Amino acid sequence: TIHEFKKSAKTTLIKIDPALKIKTKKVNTADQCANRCTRNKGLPFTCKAFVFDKARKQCLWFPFNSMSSGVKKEFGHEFDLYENKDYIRNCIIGKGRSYKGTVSITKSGIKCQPWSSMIPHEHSFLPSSYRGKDLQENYCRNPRGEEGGPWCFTSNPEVRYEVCDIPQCSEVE
Amino acid sequence: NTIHEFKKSAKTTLIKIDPALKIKTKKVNTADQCANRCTRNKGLPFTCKAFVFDKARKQCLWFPFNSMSSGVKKEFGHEFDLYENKDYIRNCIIGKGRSYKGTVSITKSGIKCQPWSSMIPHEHSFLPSSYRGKDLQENYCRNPRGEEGGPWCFTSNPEVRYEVCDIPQCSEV
């Protein structure tokens, strides 16, 4: 069940609007948080994300995620944030500068190379060098808002980089 | 086994009016094998957005498109099941979400939706047959009449006839 979630290590969320619902429970593993979140049983809201506190082995279930208004993304070595994919916009606006979904395949079907790897292709697009751009794993991203839309360095040495095939939000009715 | 991650439409395949579109096929044993290959996108000269399992011919058909793509239409067939990759079904709402086709099936307060085909717990006349085009399938949040509230559903709690679902707007600044 944990695979329908995008994971951000060392991250938790804090509500700034105190009327937003939360629910917590001491649990054993992060997989058990995902299960309860996926089946949404016993939660007085739509679970959109959860955090696992690895220190206290506690789940925090939320009716919001990191893109929700009135919530902050904070660093914490004991936390892992898990965002339900159904609530991370899966289409692109303009050139997709703000795309944060989990698609990792190019238009012609090649698997993307992780942004933190220099083979097949060497580059200067490190996470460190692009704060806020979410250059995590091998996700299609568009850090500089360039023409093509989200793209990635391709795991095929013959093709340096190729755009992905993430649809425009305007594509369909 | 990634098959339960797809939006399933029974008795359905897709045909391309557009001769340019690429499809890929392979004789196989079970529908899970089509799913596994779509998820992994291995050996496909394109991004797999949907697949069909043909139960009679024991074949997978993999598509770089889905039932919402232009230049494609549905075709009825008892031997066919269609599986659409949720990553390519727009998961946010435009306007009132008349055209929402995503799979969120829980209300704002966390109540599992009642199936549109069921009169239990609530009797109603939003039968799929009265609302063709509106995809009143399974128990998905829908707004078949395009009302102010956004997508909604009859509720599995006998005390709550219906409630709106909490699906984000694609773009609202």
Curated annotation (Swiss-Prot), chain B:
Disulfide bonds join 34-60, 38-48, 92-170, 113-153, 141-165. Residues 92-170 form the Kringle domain. It comes from the Eukaryota. Residues 1-87 form the PAN domain. This is Hepatocyte growth factor alpha chain. It comes from Homo sapiens (Human).
